[PDB]
């Protein structure tokens, strides 16, 4: 009765996730592994393979290249932000919250969920790009100049640990609903109807991992730790911004690399 | 100029 209602909440969340996010983890993994119909992604692993890429213009200046990448990738994230907002309205009790608190919770949670979406696109060797038609290597990203080599390596590091948990789309829905309903965000008017939906969401999650991963070991706690890791990736972005502002120049970067980085986050 | 909140607010409505 209590546990039946937990399972039903889990189900409702998963159908509503399926409906809000066309790019599921299962579809990204099919692309990556090779279950795919359509031709495999093109691999970019060096400058020669970069330039043999015409599957995707004007003249950015050294001390703006990075900022313009960051702006570029955030503006390209709007579709993702709208899908997460769509999903969020489906979480029971959400739209019942004070409109101001709905916006607040999305404004913070959206960054963390985006990194969860990125981990789907990653494996230990690299990341899908250009709507899943290309694949950029981890080693090549890391090789690049100046401050750019350290943009993505810490995101890879997280994704590899997060992807080792082997969550599927039905676990991810609940996990994502939990992130959104975080009682601690800055400026929340009423931090308690929020904490109460979350607690209910934690129970369903706890049950979901028992049913779905009956072999596993502290999966629930390991997954709750990742919420902390997600916040740190977001806050680490502020430090990175400082590093750009006073680097030993130059920060030119081939256009096509700029284009590639705007598909990341 | 309209930021992240605005796109969130427009999608909620
Ligand atoms: C967009 C594209 C690439 C990268 N990156 O190489 O680290 C970062 C971004 C980005 O702007 N991410 C971001 C901004 C603000 N909050 C969180 C993440």
Domain spans of chain A, in order of start: 1-265
Calculate how close chain A gets to B10, using CA atoms only, in Å. 9
Interchain proximity A86–B11, CB inside 8 Å: yes
Q: What's the A234 CA to ligand 1 centre distance in angstroms?
A: 8
User: Under DSSP, is residue A219 helix (H, G, I), strand (E, B) or coil?
Assistant: helix
The protein residue with its alpha carbon nearest to ligand 1, atom 16, reads: A234
Q: How was this structure determined?
A: X-ray
Is residue A117 within 8 A of residue A23, CB to CB? The reply is: yes
- Please tell me the distance from the alpha carbon of residue A59 to that of residue A9, in angstroms, as a whole number: 51
Interchain proximity B12–A102, CB inside 8 Å: yes
The protein residue with its alpha carbon nearest to ligand 1, atom 11, reads: A70
Does residue A7 have a cis bond before it (omega within 30 degrees)? no
Is residue A128 within 8 A of residue A31, CB to CB? The reply is: yes
The span from the first CA to the last CA of chain B, in angstroms, equals: 19
User: Under DSSP, is residue A254 helix (H, G, I), strand (E, B) or coil?
Assistant: coil
CA A232 vs CA A35, A74, A84, A115, A248: distances in Å: 34, 18, 20, 11, 26
User: Under DSSP, is residue A258 helix (H, G, I), strand (E, B) or coil?
Assistant: helix
Is residue A9 within 8 A of residue A177, CB to CB? The reply is: no
User: Which residue has 């030993």 as its token pair?
Assistant: A248
Say if residue A8 is exposed, middle or buried (CB neighbours under 10 Å; 0-12, 13-18, 19+): exposed
Is residue A55 within 8 A of residue A135, CB to CB? The reply is: no
Quickly list H helices, B1-13: 4-12
Question: Would strands A42-44 and A134-137 be described as parallel, antiparallel, or unpaired?
Answer: parallel
- Contact residues for A30 (Cβ-Cβ < 8 A; gap 6+): A36
User: Under DSSP, is residue A32 helix (H, G, I), strand (E, B) or coil?
Assistant: helix
CA-closest candidate to residue A77, choices A44, A50, A106: A106
Half-sphere exposure of A2 (CA within 13 A, CB side): 4
CA-closest candidate to residue A253, choices A85, A114, A67: A67
A138 C-beta neighbours (distance < 10 Å), count:
21
Q: Edge-to-edge, what's the strand order for the sheet holding A42-44? A: A42-44, A134-137, A126-129, A122-123
- Contact residues for A146 (Cβ-Cβ < 8 A; gap 6+): A247, A248, A249, A250, A251, A253
CA-closest candidate to residue A10, choices A177, A228, A187: A177
The structure tokens listed for A143 are 């090789």
Q: What's the A73 CA to ligand 1 centre distance in angstroms?
A: 7
- Please tell me the distance from the alpha carbon of residue A255 to that of residue A53, in angstroms, as a whole number: 12
Stated as kind and residue range, the H or E segment containing A91 is: none
Is residue A157 within 8 A of residue A66, CB to CB? The reply is: no
- Please tell me the distance from the alpha carbon of residue A148 to that of residue A135, in angstroms, as a whole number: 18
- Please tell me the distance from the alpha carbon of residue A229 to that of residue A234, in angstroms, as a whole number: 9
Stated as kind and residue range, the H or E segment containing A191 is: none
- Please tell me the distance from the alpha carbon of residue A212 to that of residue A123, in angstroms, as a whole number: 22
């Amino acid at each position: 009765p209590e546990s039946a209602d937990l399972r039903a909440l889990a189900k409702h969340l998963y159908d509503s996730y399926i409906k809000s996010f066309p790019l599921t983890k299962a579809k990204a993994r099919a692309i990556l592994t090779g279950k795919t119909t359509d031709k495999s992604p093109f691999v970019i692993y060096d400058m020669n393979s970069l330039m043999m890429g015409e599957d995707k213009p004007l003249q950015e200046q050294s001390k703006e290249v990075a900022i313009r990448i960051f702006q570029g990738c955030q503006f390209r994230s709007v579709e993702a932000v709208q899908e997460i907002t769509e999903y969020a309205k489906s979480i029971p009790g959400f739209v019942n919250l004070d409109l101001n608190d709905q916006v607040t919770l999305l404004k913070y949670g959206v960054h963390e969920i985006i990194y969860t979406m990125l981990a789907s696109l990653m494996n230990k060797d690299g990341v899908l790009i250009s709507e899943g038609q290309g694949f950029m290597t981890r080693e090549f990203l890391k090789s690049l100049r100046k401050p750019f080599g350290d943009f993505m390596e810490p995101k890879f590091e997280f994704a590899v640990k997060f992807n080792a948990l082997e969550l599927d789309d039905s676990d991810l829905a609940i996990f994502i609903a939990v992130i959104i309903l975080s009682g601690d965000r800055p400026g929340l008017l009423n931090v308690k109807p929020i904490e109460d939906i979350q607690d209910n969401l934690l129970q369903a999650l706890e049950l979901q991992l028992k049913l779905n991963h009956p072999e596993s070991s502290q999966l629930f706690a390991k997954l709750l730790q990742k919420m902390t890791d997600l916040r740190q990736i977001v806050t680490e972005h502020v430090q990175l911004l400082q590093v750009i502002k006073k680097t030993e120049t130059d920060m030119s970067l081939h256009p096509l690399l700029q284009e590639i980085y705007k598909d990341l986050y | 100029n309209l930021g992240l909140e605005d796109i969130i607010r427009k999608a909620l409505m």
